[PDB]
Amino acid sequence: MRPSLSDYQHVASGKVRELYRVDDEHLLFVATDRISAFDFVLDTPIPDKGRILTAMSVFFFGLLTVPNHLAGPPDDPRIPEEVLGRALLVRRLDMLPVECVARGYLTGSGLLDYQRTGAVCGHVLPQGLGEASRLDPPLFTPATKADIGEHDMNVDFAAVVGLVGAVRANQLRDETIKIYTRAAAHALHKGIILADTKFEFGVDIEGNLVLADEVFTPDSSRYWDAAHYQPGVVQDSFDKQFVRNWLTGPESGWDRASDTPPPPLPDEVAVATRERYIEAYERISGLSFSDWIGP
Ligand SMILES: CCOC(=O)[C@@H](F)[C@H](O)c1ccc(Br)cn1
């Protein structure tokens, strides 16, 4: 028999994820069905999104050889029925206060910083780059969390040294670039570009660096269709473009520039979005989502 979620202490809440205490040395990482667009958490959930993103994380934890925070199987008895398939049993770690970001392509705040200064997070770049330009080798572009509602602040390597130490900062940079390079090549071989990714790490009792976050989900990473990749224009979001198109189109009745919260989504847009998440998972993993555990 599985415990109730109310048997555990709710310890933290995020935009589309939740965290619970299991005992002194273990936590429960939970993915919800909520989705974000244009910096709003939308009213309408995407069915099975939490389960699909958890399947994705478990696949990539398996593929990568680096230590990670998993402390049990996806069907561990300590996981409540209500979150089965969208929750993981993990070990408690001393977390490092650095958002460890790798970028293989120039977009978002990376592109903006380049267009303003000619550099990104202390990396002076060649002249002549633009939207969705390839960056090779990929860049370590660390950031720090700001206040509620605000975007993370981009920082340089020296800033990271002052947060975690010189030797540890070099380790974060090296492991972030190594892991991203491997995952990106794997996805591209199957027709999906991982344009960038954001990692969070912790340290265990022996001093070892441990990957401790969801990993390579379409929330932590920009997924693009490789078949339509064209440097110089904005790329469609593999998972979120149907949501974006409806919200900004003729039928929503919503003006993005009003900064008012958006309306609920059509049921059919939510179902089409679920299909897109399933397509991304099955193409990258080579597995079938119909075999992933659930309630
Ligand atoms: C950059 C270090 O991050 C942390 O310290 C952790 F708390 C972790 O990122 C976290 C936060 C909120 C939720 Br919900 C789940 N996990």
DSSP per-residue string spanning the chain: -PPPGGGSEEEEE-SSEEEEEEETTEEEEEE-S--EETTEE-SS--TTHHHHHHHHHHHHHHHS-S-B-B-S-TT-TTS-GGGTTSEEEEE--EE-S-BEEEEEEE-HHHHHHHHHHSEETTEE--TT--TTEEEEEEEE--EE--STTSPPEE--HHHHHHHH-HHHHHHHHHHHHHHHHHHHHHHHHTTEEEEEEEE-EEE-TTS-EEE-S--S-TTTEEEEEGGG--TTSPPPPTTTHHHHHHHTSTTS---GGG-SPPPPPPHHHHHHHHHHHHHHHHHHH-S-GGGS---
User: What is the Cα–Cα distance from 58 to 287, expressed in whole angstroms?
Assistant: 12
Largest Cα separation within the chain, whole Å, is: 61
Residues 45, 102 within the same domain: no
Domain boundary among 33, 65, 94: 94
- Same-domain pairing of 39 and 54: yes
CA of 19, closest atom in ligand 1 = 14
- The reply to whether 72 falls in a domain is yes
Regarding whether 66 and 32 lie in a shared domain, the answer is: yes
Residues in the chain: 295
- Ligand 1 close to Cβ of residue 14 (< 6 A): yes
Any ligand 1 atom below 6 A from CB of 33: no
Query: Are residues 47 and 178 located together in one domain of the fold?
Result: no
Instruction: Give the count of domains, the chain.
Output: 2
Structural domain contains residue 285: no
Is residue 138 in some structural domain? Answer: yes
Cis omega before residue 137 (within 30°)? yes
Q: Report CA torsion sign: 118, 123, 125, 131.
A: negative
The technique by which this structure was obtained is X-ray
The alpha carbon of 4 and the centre of ligand 1 are apart by a number of angstroms equal to 23
CA-proximal residue: ligand 1, atom 5 (nearest): 95
Q: Do 216 and 105 belong to one domain? A: yes
Which of 134, 144, 166, 133 has the alpha carbon at shortest distance from 100?
144
Phi/psi-derived region of residue 259, left when phi > 0, alpha when psi is between -120 and 50, beta in every other case: left
Pocket lining: 214 vs ligand 1, CB cutoff 6 Å: no
Give domain status of residue 248, yes or no.
no
Question: Are 100 and 117 contained in the same domain?
Answer: yes
Q: How far is CA 239 from the centre of its chain?
A: 12
- Centroid of ligand 1 to alpha carbon of 249 (angstroms): 35
Q: How far is the CA of 293 from the centre of ligand 1 (A)?
A: 25
- Point out the domain boundary residue: 94, 119, 144: 94
Closest to 175 measured CA to CA, from 92, 94, 67: 67
In this structure, what are the phi and psi dihedrals at residue 132, rounded to the nearest 5 degrees?
Answer: 65, 20
Residue 281 placed within a domain? no
80: in domain: yes
Are 61 and 130 found together in one domain? no
216 and 155 in a single domain? The answer is yes
State whether 183 and 208 are in the same domain: yes
Query: Which residue's CA is minimally distant from atom 7 of ligand 1?
Result: 95
Asked whether residue 247 is domain-assigned, the answer is no
Same domain, 48 and 105: no
Q: Which residues contact 93 (CB under 8 A, 6 or more apart)?
A: 69, 202, 203, 204, 210, 212
Resolution of this model in Å is 1.5
* Residue 67 lies in domain: 1-94
- In this structure, are 163 and 35 located in the same domain? no
Residue 249 falls within a domain, yes or no? no
